[PDB]
Amino acid sequence: HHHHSSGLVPRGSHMSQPSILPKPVSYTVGSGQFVLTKNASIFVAGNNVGETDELFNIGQALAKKLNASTGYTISVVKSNQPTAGSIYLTTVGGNAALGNEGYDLITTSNQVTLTANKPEGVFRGNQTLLQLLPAGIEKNTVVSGVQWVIPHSNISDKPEYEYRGLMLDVARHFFTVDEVKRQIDLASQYKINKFHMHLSDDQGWRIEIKSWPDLIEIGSKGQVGGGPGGYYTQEQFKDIVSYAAERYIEVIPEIDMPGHTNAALASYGELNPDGKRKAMRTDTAVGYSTLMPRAEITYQFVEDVISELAAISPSPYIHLGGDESNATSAADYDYFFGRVTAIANSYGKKVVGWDPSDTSSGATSDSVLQNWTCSASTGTAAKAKGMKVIVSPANAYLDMKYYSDSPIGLQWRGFVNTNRAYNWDPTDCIKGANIYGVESTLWTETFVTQDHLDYMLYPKLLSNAEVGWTARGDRNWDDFKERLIEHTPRLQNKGIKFFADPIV
Numbered sequence: 001h002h003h004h005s006s007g008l009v010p011r012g013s014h015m016s017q018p019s020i021l022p023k024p025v026s027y028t029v030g031s032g033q034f035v036l037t038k039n040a041s042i043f044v045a046g047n048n049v050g051e052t053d054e055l056f057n058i059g060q061a062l063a064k065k066l067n068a069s070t071g072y073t074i075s076v077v078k079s080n081q082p083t084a085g086s087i088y089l090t091t092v093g094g095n096a097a098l099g100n101e102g103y104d105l106i107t108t109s110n111q112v113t114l115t116a117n118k119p120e121g122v123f124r125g126n127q128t129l130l131q132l133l134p135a136g137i138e139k140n141t142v143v144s145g146v147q148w149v150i151p152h153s154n155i156s157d158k159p160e161y162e163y164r165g166l167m168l169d170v171a172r173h174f175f176t177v178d179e180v181k182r183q184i185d186l187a188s189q190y191k192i193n194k195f196h197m198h199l200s201d202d203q204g205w206r207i208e209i210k211s212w213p214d215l216i217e218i219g220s221k222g223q224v225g226g227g228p229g230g231y232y233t234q235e236q237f238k239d240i241v242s243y244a245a246e247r248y249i250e251v252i253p254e255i256d257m258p259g260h261t262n263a264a265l266a267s268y269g270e271l272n273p274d275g276k277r278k279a280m281r282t283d284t285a286v287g288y289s290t291l292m293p294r295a296e297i298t299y300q301f302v303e304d305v306i307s308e309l310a311a312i313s314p315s316p317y318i319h320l321g322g323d324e325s326n327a328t329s330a331a332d333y334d335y336f337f338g339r340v341t342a343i344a345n346s347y348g349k350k351v352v353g354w355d356p357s358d359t360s361s362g363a364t365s366d367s368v369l370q371n372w373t374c375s376a377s378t379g380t381a382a383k384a385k386g387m388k389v390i391v392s393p394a395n396a397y398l399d400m401k402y403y404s405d406s407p408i409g410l411q412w413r414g415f416v417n418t419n420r421a422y423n424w425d426p427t428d429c430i431k432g433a434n435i436y437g438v439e440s441t442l443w444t445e446t447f448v449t450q451d452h453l454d455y456m457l458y459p460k461l462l463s464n465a466e467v468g469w470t471a472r473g474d475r476n477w478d479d480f481k482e483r484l485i486e487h488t489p490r491l492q493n494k495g496i497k498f499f500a501d502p503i504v
């Protein structure tokens with residue numbers, strides 16, 4: 001047999017017909033179609049009234065989306081007796097083998113029926129349902145001239161990995177609450193279920209801490225390259241968390257320590273050995289900053305921050321960073337990371353940290369490693385301790401240039417095009433681990449606008465999303481590439497300023 005790898009498409013990028021991404025466990029099509037008309041309702045039915053009420057909210061979110069493009073006013077009914085032409089969302093009789101996020105989705109001429117185990121799984125299945133309707137459905141304004149049809153079809157589905165996440169760096173360049181919500185919204189449509197916010201770094205501190213007000217008054221006032229910066233009040237952070245929750249997305253806030261801490265060091269002189277504030281930094285260096293690992297003030301500061309953040313962050317996890325502490329000795333890092341893990345745990349939060357944070361003797365088997373290095377020895381400690389691992393290899397570093405000539409992005413992990421973002425498996429990063437799942441990271445040294453975010457995340461994030469959801473035996477670049485071409489009008493329809501990658 002003969003085999004080949006993909007080159008660029010001759011003559012440039014390529015960027016009744018459902019476009020399902022990530023690819024579901026199974027999808028068959030039969031004869032006939034359902035027609036969504038102006039008289040359609042969404043019926044919801046759970047195993048008790050409280051579950052029905054949660055399904056009702058999910059139905060209303062679906063209706064709002066459908067109404068925007070169809071110009072209809074589809075309403076939601078609490079009943080297990082849907083009428084011909086109805087969409088029906090239920091958790092009564094879910095197939096347990098499909099888990100919390102899994103669902104069956106069967107479309108007949110008279111009815112769309114989504115059957116899941118939990119409300120969360122109906123939310124995920126609704127993302128597939130939007131992809132079964134014609135391109136045009138994902139428009140934010142009324143589309144005319146398109147019959148709203150869904151082919152007679154049968155889908156069953158469930159994720160391969162539990163953790164399928166996106167990190168946004170809001171420290172290097174700040175993005176508004178609206179801009180963050182939009183990225184969360186877009187990601188949710190591809191079954192991303194986790195959002196990691198990198199809220200502090202050398203060039204900016206982005207979360208209001210009432211007990212340490214100069215973190216904002218001084219530390220939020222810049223960004224890479226110099227510029228106004230910005231921050232989230234605690235109310236604005238709660239608003240983000242709530243918006244994410246409606247999409248069954250967990251938000252994990254990161255306060256990076258003991259390195260990548262210049263913004264805090266520039267806000268409070270008492271955090272520095274000489275008692276003086278650092279100057280704020282707008283460059284892109286490079287592992288130089290450290291908290292004082294042997295000063296009690298450091299741990300008082302960390303505790304105040306953790307206390308305030310824990311009070312407003314319902315996720316059982318807090319991310320404490322731990323990357324590139326090059327100005328911290330190995331002994332002091334071990335010590336520091338163990339102490340701050342104990343503080344976090346005292347506030348009822350489990351700690352996620354970048355490698356090498358798993359090597360801290362203060363870590364517990366409840367701590368999580370985010371493995372970005374992905375070398376042979378990375379996560380030896382995590383594995384030995386029974387710690388779950390989230391992988392973020394080069395293939396998930398979405399801030400890398402697509403190509404040598406990309407007008408934005410970095411290149412310290414090489415180039416990451418749409419193909420590279422697809423052709424990998426979490427087991428490539430680490431062997432012998434409990435892999436919790438995958439996280440796409442979008443660092444923002446070089447991204448200043450929403451259009452920059454769109455360009456790098458789309459289509460790359462779609463590749464990573466499939467690696468998290470679709471089983472490896474069912475993944476194939478040639479298949480995905482052709483599906484991505486078909487999906488293009490949908491990206492356009494959503495207003496995504498994607499890069500038309502010439503490898504697609």
Ligand SMILES: CC(=O)N[C@H]1CN2CC[C@H](O)[C@@H]2[C@@H](O)[C@@H]1O
Pocket residue numbers: 284323324354372412443444445
């Ligand atoms: C976990 C991680 O990727 N940390 C840093 C790794 N460095 C390497 C050089 C880049 O500035 C990049 C920076 O964007 C990231 O914040």
